[PDB]
Amino acid sequence: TASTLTRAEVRGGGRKPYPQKKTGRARRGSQGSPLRPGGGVIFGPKPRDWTIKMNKKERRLALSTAIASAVGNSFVVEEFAENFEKPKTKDFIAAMQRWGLDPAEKSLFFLMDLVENVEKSGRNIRTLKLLTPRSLNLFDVLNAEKLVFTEGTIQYLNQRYGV
């Protein structure tokens, strides 16, 4: 959105040079030089929308390594579907107090326990992302080394990333 001056010389005013002949001053006009202040601009960023078009099979197999390199180490494991019930958040702080890492080692908290809706209680916390178990990109997954799932979300991950 770095909208600049497209039509340089075409600003609030116009090009109105002076008698350019036998004077001494640079042969040029004023305003929208644009070299001179209060003028337009030659080159400059335009309303861009860089959005590369990606395939499908190139993404499915590109997101499989995400959970693969995760389950390989000793990161957070799955949980249960009864996690969607708890409408409060305090019940979570006490929960994350058992699995470990209470003071939050860092932004390592890629949460994806729910499926249908979002955990309005797990979004409050500073470091933690509530991603829906469907389009798990390589970004967020590796964004937080620690990631927690459930017995349900793990199933949906087999529908797309699988057969």
Binding site: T4, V41, I42, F43, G44
Partner: protein, 119 residues
């Protein structure tokens, strides 16, 4: 196009040229241009004096002995002198080792009698 703002960037590209310029007589050390035409000189001449430094002495050594030849007896040339050692077998006493003339002229006096015996 609103650049990334040179600011201090273009500030270091000139002062660095000034630090080098801190021993010049003229005002070639208080202006990027006055020094621009100055550094190039110390940029070319430097590439010369480095190779000239060897030649600069090539004439010196010979001149050092030359001033020492006009007193002994071999008013001919120091070439015959070098020829003596050459025909002899002395890979020593080089143009640089010719410093035996000024200091301890007693050692350089020996070779004077050794060059005649050979040739």
């Amino acid at each position: 196009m609103t650049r990334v703002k040179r600011g201090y960037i273009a500030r270091r590209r000139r002062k660095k040229i000034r630090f080098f310029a801190s021993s010049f007589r003229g005002a070639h050390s208080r202006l990027t241009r006055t020094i621009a035409q100055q550094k190039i000189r110390a940029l070319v001449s430097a590439h010369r004096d480095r190779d000239r430094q060897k030649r600069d002495f090539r004439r010196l050594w010979i001149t050092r002995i030359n001033a020492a030849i006009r007193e002994r007896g071999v008013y001919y040339n120091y070439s015959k002198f070098i020829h003596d050692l050459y025909k002899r077998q002395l890979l020593l006493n080089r143009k640089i080792l010719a410093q035996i003339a000024i200091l301890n002229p007693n050692c350089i006096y020996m070779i004077y009698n050794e060059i005649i015996k050979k040739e």
